[PDB]
Design a binder for this molecule. Sequence first.
Ligand SMILES: *[C@@H]1O[C@H](CO)[C@@H](O[C@@H]2O[C@H](CO)[C@@H](O[C@@H]3O[C@H](CO[C@H]4O[C@H](CO[C@H]5O[C@H](CO)[C@@H](O)[C@H](O)[C@@H]5O)[C@@H](O)[C@H](O)[C@@H]4O)[C@@H](O)[C@H](O[C@H]4O[C@H](CO)[C@@H](O)[C@H](O)[C@@H]4O[C@H]4O[C@H](CO)[C@@H](O)[C@H](O)[C@@H]4O[C@H]4O[C@H](CO)[C@@H](O)[C@H](O)[C@@H]4O)[C@@H]3O)[C@H](O)[C@H]2NC(C)=O)[C@H](O)[C@H]1NC(C)=O
Ligand SMILES: *[C@@H]1O[C@H](CO)[C@@H](O[C@@H]2O[C@H](CO)[C@@H](O[C@@H]3O[C@H](CO[C@H]4O[C@H](CO[C@H]5O[C@H](CO)[C@@H](O)[C@H](O)[C@@H]5O)[C@@H](O)[C@H](O[C@H]5O[C@H](CO)[C@@H](O)[C@H](O)[C@@H]5O)[C@@H]4O)[C@@H](O)[C@H](O[C@H]4O[C@H](CO)[C@@H](O)[C@H](O)[C@@H]4O)[C@@H]3O)[C@H](O)[C@H]2NC(C)=O)[C@H](O)[C@H]1NC(C)=O
Ligand SMILES: *[C@@H]1O[C@H](CO)[C@@H](O[C@@H]2O[C@H](CO)[C@@H](O[C@@H]3O[C@H](CO)[C@@H](O)[C@H](O[C@H]4O[C@H](CO)[C@@H](O)[C@H](O)[C@@H]4O)[C@@H]3O)[C@H](O)[C@H]2NC(C)=O)[C@H](O)[C@H]1NC(C)=O
Ligand SMILES: *[C@@H]1O[C@H](CO)[C@@H](O[C@@H]2O[C@H](CO)[C@@H](O[C@@H]3O[C@H](CO)[C@@H](O)[C@H](O)[C@@H]3O)[C@H](O)[C@H]2NC(C)=O)[C@H](O)[C@H]1NC(C)=O
Ligand SMILES: *[C@@H]1O[C@H](CO)[C@@H](O[C@@H]2O[C@H](CO)[C@@H](O)[C@H](O)[C@H]2NC(C)=O)[C@H](O)[C@H]1NC(C)=O
Ligand SMILES: *[C@@H]1O[C@H](CO)[C@@H](O[C@@H]2O[C@H](CO)[C@@H](O)[C@H](O)[C@H]2NC(C)=O)[C@H](O)[C@H]1NC(C)=O
Ligand SMILES: *[C@@H]1O[C@H](CO)[C@@H](O[C@@H]2O[C@H](CO)[C@@H](O)[C@H](O)[C@H]2NC(C)=O)[C@H](O)[C@H]1NC(C)=O
Ligand code: NAG
Ligand code: NAG
Ligand code: NAG
Ligand code: NAG
Ligand code: NAG
Lengths: 447, 129, 129, 223
Amino acid sequence: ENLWVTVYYGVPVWKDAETTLFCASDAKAYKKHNVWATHACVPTDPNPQEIHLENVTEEFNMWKNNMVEQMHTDIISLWDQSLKPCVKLTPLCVTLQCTNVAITDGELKNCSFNMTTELRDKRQKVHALFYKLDIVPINENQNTSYRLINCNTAAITQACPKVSFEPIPIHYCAPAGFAILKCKDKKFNGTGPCPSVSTVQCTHGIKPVVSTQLLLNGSLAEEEVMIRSEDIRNNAKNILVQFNTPVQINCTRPNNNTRKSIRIGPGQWFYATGDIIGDIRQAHCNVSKATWNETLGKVVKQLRKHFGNNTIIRFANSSGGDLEVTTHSFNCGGEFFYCDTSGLFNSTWISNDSITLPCRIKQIINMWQRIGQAMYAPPIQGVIRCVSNITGLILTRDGGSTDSTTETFRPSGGDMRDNWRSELYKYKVVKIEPLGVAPTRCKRRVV
Amino acid sequence: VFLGFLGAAGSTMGAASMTLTVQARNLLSLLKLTVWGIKQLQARVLAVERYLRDQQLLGIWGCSGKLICCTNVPWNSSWSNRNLSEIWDNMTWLQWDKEISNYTQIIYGLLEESQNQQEKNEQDLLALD
Amino acid sequence: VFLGFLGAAGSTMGAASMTLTVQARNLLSLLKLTVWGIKQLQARVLAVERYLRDQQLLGIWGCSGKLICCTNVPWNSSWSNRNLSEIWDNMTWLQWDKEISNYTQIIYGLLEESQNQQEKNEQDLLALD
Amino acid sequence: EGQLVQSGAELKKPGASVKISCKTSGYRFNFYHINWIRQTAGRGPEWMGWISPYSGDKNLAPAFQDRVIMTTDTEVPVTSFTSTGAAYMEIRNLKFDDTGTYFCAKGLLRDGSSTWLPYLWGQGTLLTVSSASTKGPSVFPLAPGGTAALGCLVKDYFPEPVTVSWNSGALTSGVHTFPAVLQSSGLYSLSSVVTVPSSSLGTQTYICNVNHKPSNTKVDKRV
Ligand SMILES: *[C@@H]1O[C@H](CO)[C@@H](O[C@@H]2O[C@H](CO)[C@@H](O[C@@H]3O[C@H](CO[C@H]4O[C@H](CO[C@H]5O[C@H](CO)[C@@H](O)[C@H](O)[C@@H]5O)[C@@H](O)[C@H](O)[C@@H]4O)[C@@H](O)[C@H](O[C@H]4O[C@H](CO)[C@@H](O)[C@H](O)[C@@H]4O[C@H]4O[C@H](CO)[C@@H](O)[C@H](O)[C@@H]4O[C@H]4O[C@H](CO)[C@@H](O)[C@H](O)[C@@H]4O)[C@@H]3O)[C@H](O)[C@H]2NC(C)=O)[C@H](O)[C@H]1NC(C)=O
Ligand SMILES: *[C@@H]1O[C@H](CO)[C@@H](O[C@@H]2O[C@H](CO)[C@@H](O[C@@H]3O[C@H](CO[C@H]4O[C@H](CO[C@H]5O[C@H](CO)[C@@H](O)[C@H](O)[C@@H]5O)[C@@H](O)[C@H](O[C@H]5O[C@H](CO)[C@@H](O)[C@H](O)[C@@H]5O)[C@@H]4O)[C@@H](O)[C@H](O[C@H]4O[C@H](CO)[C@@H](O)[C@H](O)[C@@H]4O)[C@@H]3O)[C@H](O)[C@H]2NC(C)=O)[C@H](O)[C@H]1NC(C)=O
Ligand SMILES: *[C@@H]1O[C@H](CO)[C@@H](O[C@@H]2O[C@H](CO)[C@@H](O[C@@H]3O[C@H](CO)[C@@H](O)[C@H](O[C@H]4O[C@H](CO)[C@@H](O)[C@H](O)[C@@H]4O)[C@@H]3O)[C@H](O)[C@H]2NC(C)=O)[C@H](O)[C@H]1NC(C)=O
Ligand SMILES: *[C@@H]1O[C@H](CO)[C@@H](O[C@@H]2O[C@H](CO)[C@@H](O[C@@H]3O[C@H](CO)[C@@H](O)[C@H](O)[C@@H]3O)[C@H](O)[C@H]2NC(C)=O)[C@H](O)[C@H]1NC(C)=O
Ligand SMILES: *[C@@H]1O[C@H](CO)[C@@H](O[C@@H]2O[C@H](CO)[C@@H](O)[C@H](O)[C@H]2NC(C)=O)[C@H](O)[C@H]1NC(C)=O
Ligand SMILES: *[C@@H]1O[C@H](CO)[C@@H](O[C@@H]2O[C@H](CO)[C@@H](O)[C@H](O)[C@H]2NC(C)=O)[C@H](O)[C@H]1NC(C)=O
Ligand SMILES: *[C@@H]1O[C@H](CO)[C@@H](O[C@@H]2O[C@H](CO)[C@@H](O)[C@H](O)[C@H]2NC(C)=O)[C@H](O)[C@H]1NC(C)=O
Ligand SMILES: *[C@@H]1O[C@H](CO)[C@@H](O)[C@H](O)[C@H]1NC(C)=O
Ligand SMILES: *[C@@H]1O[C@H](CO)[C@@H](O)[C@H](O)[C@H]1NC(C)=O
Ligand SMILES: *[C@@H]1O[C@H](CO)[C@@H](O)[C@H](O)[C@H]1NC(C)=O
Ligand SMILES: *[C@@H]1O[C@H](CO)[C@@H](O)[C@H](O)[C@H]1NC(C)=O
Ligand SMILES: *[C@@H]1O[C@H](CO)[C@@H](O)[C@H](O)[C@H]1NC(C)=O
């Protein structure tokens, strides 16, 4: 009947905490120096240990998750670390005089301009092809002298040609004393109590696929397709969608471009586009209309579960923002594509003929809302073609005072973090507090 | 019977108290200026810092070598009124830590003062002869 | 009665020896390349390095768990000739450490060798049967 | 600190079957056995069985091993430490001596020497086994220190029970409901009275609300 406190060291007790995670990737061997894997990420253990926690029920919140905020700052910081040593194209802001590529009734333009040479006193005139988006006319009156789009706002640096932009699986690990809780509930929505929970030291192979509008190469939701949002009632917050069946999308750049290596200084090398060899075709992606119409129908079924079992569900193209947010932007073999998705979100729902999408390309880009530094993607030699998985989406309501009679859904890409949340919805970081004090009928011996 | 790290987190406190070794093991174990290197090194220093703090508390409570140690501090009923069967056969360490997280700091202070600071002086005066 | 960290630094050695827990507690507890970050991380590594060194000495003296431990080493009078009342009721740990800082290294060597290196082999031969 | 709410009373003819439900909340439904105990006038209290929501193991007393089927649904989580659930008991081959009150009960401890011991009990479900048909009640007014008493008389109803409220539950003080009488005909009758100050005739209107769910009849009588 006399109770005394006793210290237990190693009690399964944890508390919500945010710590500094680190990198971990398999032992992939090779060209290399891919930005994300870096020179050294801790190689994944030959065998990971996933330990299911019986009887455990933990509250999750993918929208207040700090793993997202950390990953975001890691991608940004990794990008800058790879641009620092590469060649900066400060002298490439010389006035450009551009002409058309002949044809009657032009996305790319043939530009001639003078560029410095190895020797300070000598100069050289070189001709290189450019895309319309990367250039603006220096007159508007108009004459026809053009300049690079970035020279007015921020400097520019050329991405090194060796580093590759292909995402590889990356595992986010937590330090000793902390742990990661994975929600294995198939039907798990955005937030809430997860009945089935397990613990792991590192996450699964998460590929840092930077996309917009459409989610590519992600992980497929099990069982039914999932509709995740922070506030379905609030139109302002985006809507994450995860497919149970992946749709296939083929993007190609049929032009047989060429790489022109023009030295612009001692050691500095600039890689310009070389006249195209062969026909002049524009890049485009294909999607099977049967699968997409089927996949889009499965989405509207889960959509009605939150907007009434019967309601008008239409789809329109992006009507807000410009440039990145209006086009399904992404990377493919080193070239940055920008596709018009009006053909995919152009339906209305109530109660082998593959779709084609126009894609334009740029070589000067400012990703992640970066203000101050632009990057020049060196031209990729040969024909480019990449087959990717479209696993998720990012939608948004139009809002307004419509009496709930009809609901409209448009794509968007407001923030880059939503891409990370599409793969970090199931994980959570907690710290282990192994000191527990409890009363027992034991007493220390006075001896 | 081993379930793995934190396997008994949903079990009763009595069942979890049997596998404290499991949590004890996995509790500690040209330019290197990469973003990963700075994160890793800072993560490693954070892990040993937390481990040494808990081992520090066990040291000042005279319980360094053991996972289960008994003390001289009596259980003040204001902390919890639950009987032994209700505590050890009806509650998990999680919901227990939540019920007593309020008085943990007070309990830790009594745990370092009441015994091991009194015990060591009395141990010298006892083995003094 | 608690005065705080190092509160009894000017008190007699006997009075200071009562609050050793106080010193024991507070004895351990895009680019992060800032001058502060490098200083902090290097400071944190320095703190755990000093703590582990003192705990290392307590380990090799068989006194790991305790703040007050008795040994087998007899007090050689050449170190200090002062009686117990004069040491513990007339001197502070500061002026004591100054009077014995001269022979501390010799004393530490006898402290690790004389007992715990002899004690452990004799402990195996004693519990051998 | 959780409540178990059982389904309403039912009248069934002998030979038929009936399924009683027991919805839980305020605790982890998965962590405690759900027991089923009944009380009849002929045999007193009688333990029927329990079932584990976690594993599904059931233990039925031999007297009900061949006529009772116990099932449970999966818990719907609310917080990390609480959830909502539901357990069911289907009893078949009903007899007249099976008429009585049935209870579901939550176990005592998750572990120990008496884990399943019924600790938290529901409000009970009244089961009547009879060949007679349901009959709705007839409600009559009971005409009325300066205090007085008034109420409503519920005469000739079947089966039990009948619930009485005042002013749609707004009037609870001074209410006195009396147990029912068992007429020689086999029908029940009860009375309900409320004590009020006699001066409160110009400011208070007393409405007695009689609900007899077995006949699906409601009666709102102004006294
Ligand atoms: C979503 O996920 C999808 C699933 O993966 C992604 O789809 C991926 O799309 C990317 C493009 O965006 C593809 O990468 C590129 O594929 C090109 C086509 O691959 C063909 O050739 C393969 C060669 O075979 C070798 O490798 C295979 C691998 O298993 C091996 O079995 C075989 O034995 C052999 O060793 C063949 O296997 C394939 O089946 C195809 O037929 C490929 O050519 C690209 O490689 C280029 O480019 C990358 C990045 O730019 C560089 O890292 C490479 O080193 C290589 O670049 C070198 O070669 C070029 C060839 O013209 C040159 O132009 C370059 O200048 C360069 O040459 C220099 O370097 C050499 C090496 O040091 C030197 O020898 C030279 O002298 C030069 O100095 C690239 O891999 C993926 O293949 C594709 N995935 C799959 C599974 O197919 C999709 O992109 C994802 N979506 C998003 C948005 O991320
Ligand atoms: C997660 O949480 C859940 C829920 O909180 C928790 O599950 C509880 O776990 C505890 C402890 O493990 C259980 O409490 C123990 O239960 C033991 C099982 O009860 C026995 O009796 C059942 C009835 O048997 C009769 O009926 C059958 C016909 O059905 C008949 O043939 C028999 O002869 C007999 O008459 C029986 O069905 C049941 O069988 C299950 O269990 C065995 C393993 O034992 C398994 O092999 C079977 O397949 C089946 O799943 C079982 O045999 C009980 O024995 C035990 O009592 C002994 O142990 C305690 C120590 O715990 C001693 O003190 C005691 O003196 C006895 O020696 C104890 O009562 C509890 O019932 C579970 N369910 C709850 C609480 O709802 C999980 O363990 C948690 N897990 C984690 C990882 O956290
Ligand atoms: C593009 O999308 C398609 C969509 O299906 C995708 O194909 C699937 O990839 C998965 C892996 O991500 C394949 O699943 C694995 O297949 C291998 C070989 O058969 C098995 O050994 C694996 O077994 C286990 O792992 C599973 C989890 O992945 C566990 O659930 C299971 O318990 C086992 O431990 C695993 O099943 C899958 O087979 C294909 N689908 C088909 C039809 O082949 C494709 O990978 C995507 N492309 C890219 C580049 O990502
Ligand atoms: C972009 O503009 C440049 C001009 O600055 C074009 O380069 C010139 O292209 C003509 C083809 O119309 C070349 O004519 C050929 O010249 C070679 C010289 O060896 C000769 O052997 C052939 O018989 C023919 O006359 C011309 O040489 C070339 N000039 C230079 C300096 O390279 C370029 O073709 C234009 N490209 C596009 C896509 O518009
Ligand atoms: C995901 O599911 C959970 C259910 O556990 C939802 O949480 C409840 O949400 C409703 C409104 O949607 C609130 O009224 C409840 O109070 C919430 N319960 C708890 C315990 O938080 C959650 O809203 C769902 N999220 C989405 C985006 O649908
Ligand atoms: C793209 O154009 C290049 C030419 O620059 C083609 O490469 C040539 O291919 C032929 C084969 O028909 C070889 O005989 C030549 O030696 C190659 N020359 C060079 C410089 O590579 C390439 O095949 C073309 N690719 C496509 C898809 O049309
Ligand atoms: C995207 O390209 C892949 C392959 O380049 C296509 O998959 C082929 O589909 C046809 C059926 O039309 C099969 O006969 C081939 O065997 C498939 N090839 C491979 C490698 O799987 C896919 O159909 C294309 N999708 C679209 C929308 O054009
Ligand atoms: C190129 O350089 C020459 C010599 O410096 C100069 O005369 C000519 O105007 C320049 N042309 C262009 C287009 O810059
Ligand atoms: C959106 O669709 C309209 C047709 O209604 C079209 O004119 C417009 O160019 C499209 N804009 C984008 C950004 O897709
Ligand atoms: C949408 O589909 C209609 C009907 O086929 C077509 O007329 C229209 O051009 C399409 N619009 C877009 C933006 O794709
Ligand atoms: C914890 O302590 C706070 C402050 O005394 C009190 O308000 C709260 O109710 C307590 N909750 C617990 C211990 O259940
Ligand atoms: C300390 O030791 C040195 C060297 O033996 C000696 O010169 C000095 O006088 C001593 N001082 C003390 C211990 O008071």
